[PDB]
Amino acid sequence: GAMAHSKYKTYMCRDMKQRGGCPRGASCTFAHSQEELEKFRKMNKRLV
Structure with missing residues (x-):
């Protein structure tokens, strides 16, 4: 049960x-x- 359905900021570069x-x-x-x-x-957790 992820926080959001989208994982843009939660991307990973395994190619590294x-x-x-x-x-x-x-x-x-x-x-x-x-x-x-x-x-x-x-x-x-954003403050702005």
Whole structure:
């Protein structure tokens, strides 16, 4: 039961494991590693 039906900010670039040289902001949404995925909280817990 995910928080939202869409997973745009919760994207992952597994290609980083082998391949490389790709835009993070494009689709990776500044989230190439699971650690960065935590930033997804910014969507829910926002103060602005």
